[PDB]
Structures are given as C-alpha cells and as structure tokens.
Design a protein around this ligand. Structure first.
Ligand SMILES: C=CCCc1ccccc1
Length: 160
C-alpha cells in the first residue's frame, strides 16, 4: 500500500464528469473541476486540464495522469506550508500517506491546528479523537474513519 492505492480506494474512478459529495463537478480519481454550478464551466476546466476537447469524458490513462499531478500538488502544498511541513516530516511513511490524503481531499488551507500538534507529539489516540470532531468526519465518516485509523495505528489495517 502507498498513497496512490489509498486514494484510489477512497476516490474511485469515473471517466465521465460526476458530482462529488459536496455537489461539485469532478472527474477521474477525484479530480475537482470547478465549484461553479455550470456544467459548461466544468467542461472548459476539463478540456484545459487534458489539452483536448473531451466532451466531459476522459480515458483511464488521462485519469491516472491527472491523479499523479494531483497527488504531487498535495505533497507540494504540504512541503510549502510552514505549519504542515514540520508535522509531515515528523511522521513515518504510512502516516504521511494519511496526511497527503487529507490535503488531497480538503486542500492545504482546508482549522486542524490542535490535531497537527497532537500528531507531531505522537499522541495518536488523542489526535484520532480530535480529528473526528470535524465537519470532515461528520460529512464523510467512512473515509475519515479510514484516514484516522491510519493516523492512529500507523498501519494499513483500515484499507486491507
Ligand atoms: C491531520 C491534519 C491535517 C493533515 C496533515 C497532517 C500532518 C501533516 C500534514 C498534513
């Protein structure tokens, strides 16, 4: 298991524009296209992202390339953020995947100051409790539980 397998499980794969859990136009392996309610706006974002006129549909290869880019962008958002980088560097490799997963889902900016401190301190049970007191956990509880279990245990048990 690695960050790609983990997020592929959490996000699935759809080759036609769909709506995510917040109602936002998305494609591929959880690639957000736009928060605008306009499908035409989403289709324009898609064509720009892929480099061809897609008509709202992509190939598996294109979805996987977008996914690589998106995982890379999440890692970079961590490494460029003065609050996130020190915590990320303090984690082992499995827990680093949980961190990337959260940034992929909610963005580098997207209130976890106290959870970050507990993670840096390696207070895993306390961090797990604090992470669940969130809109994130309430709105996507099964995915949040898998990510939190990864932070709590440092194992892939929730995914296996
Ligand atoms: C768990 C809170 C936010 C995700 C994260 C965690 C640790 C390091 C970087 C990002």
């Amino acid at each position: 298991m690695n960050i790609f397998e983990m997020l592929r499980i959490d996000e699935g794969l759809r080759l036609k524009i769909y709506k995510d859990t917040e109602g936002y136009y998305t494609i591929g392996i959880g690639h957000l296209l736009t928060k605008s309610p306009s499908l035409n706006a989403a289709k324009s974002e898609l064509d720009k992202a892929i480099g061809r006129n897609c008509n709202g549909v992509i190939t598996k290869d294109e979805a996987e390339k977008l996914f690589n880019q998106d995982v890379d962008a999440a890692v970079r958002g961590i490494l460029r953020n003065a609050k996130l980088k020190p915590v990320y560097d303090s984690l082992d490799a499995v827990r680093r995947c949980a961190a990337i997963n959260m940034v992929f889902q909610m963005g580098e900016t997207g209130g976890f100051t106290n959870s970050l401190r507990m993670l840096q301190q390696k207070r895993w049970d306390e961090a797990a409790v604090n992470l669940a007191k969130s809109r994130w956990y309430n709105q996507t509880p099964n995915r949040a539980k898998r990510v939190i279990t990864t932070f709590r245990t440092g194992t892939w048990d929730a995914y296996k």
